[PDB]
Every structure is written in structure tokens, then in C-alpha cells.
């Protein structure tokens, strides 16, 4: 496969980050690949696709970078949900600071 060959650290590089997603589940890859990769993703896709996505830790301060603080709020109730359960997280913080997560994490994990 070659989803990432640039990235300084995809999802893929980011041990802590891929790491944590390396427990993907059905349900999860459901919602997961279902919106984020528009596939049903299957067994070396779920796993290298969760892992190189198209590149969390991109740029942010860009027109794009607001425009994932309003989809992920929203997903930020439920995303967090299903995503948090595997995302680097435990379920804790207020609204406010789940969607910053997004904006530092999902826009810069690492």
C-alpha cells in the first residue's frame, strides 16, 4: 500500500497516537471508515487506513483547519464517544476542552 509517504509522522508514525488505534473494533471501523474513509473498511484496510488516514498532523490556522472545529464539535459529542473510546483518551474534560482536542489532536496529535 503507500496512503502515506511523506507525512513527517502519519497516524501510522505517532507510536502513542497509532498506537491507541491499533485496537480498532467493528462497530468503531463502522462509524470510523464509514465517514473519515467513506468505505467499509476490512482487515488491512481498518488497519492501515485508521493508521494512515490522510495526515491528522497537517497544518491548522488554515481555512480547512476551522472548518473541522464545527464537523468535529458535533462529532465531538459523538465522535468523542466512539472515537475517544480508542483515540488517545479516557473520556474526561468539558465540551470546551473535547473540541480543542480535536484541533490539537485530530489537526496535530503526534
Known amino acids: ?8 509522522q502519519k ?7 497509532h498506537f491507541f488505534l491499533s485496537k480498532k473494533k467493528t462497530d468503531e471501523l463502522r462509524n ?16 492501515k487506513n485508521v493508521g494512515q488516514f490522510s495526515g491528522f498532523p497537517f497544518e491548522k490556522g488554515s481555512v480547512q483547519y476551522k472548518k473541522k ?13 466512539s472515537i475517544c473510546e480508542v483515540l488517545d483518551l479516557e473520556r474526561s474534560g468539558v465540551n470546551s476542552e ?3 482536542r480535536i ?8
Do not use: D
Open 1 to 8: 500500500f503507500t496512503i502515506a509517504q511523506g507525512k513527517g
Open 11 to 17: 497516524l501510522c508514525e505517532i507510536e502513542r497516537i
Open 32 to 47: 470510523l471508515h464509514k465517514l473519515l474513509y467513506n468505505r467499509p473498511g476490512t482487515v488491512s484496510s481498518l488497519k
Open 69 to 81: 472545529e464545527e464537523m468535529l464539535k458535533k462529532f465531538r459529542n459523538a465522535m468523542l464517544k
Open 98 to 100: 473535547l473540541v480543542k
Open 103 to 110: 484541533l490539537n489532536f485530530l489537526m496535530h496529535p503526534k
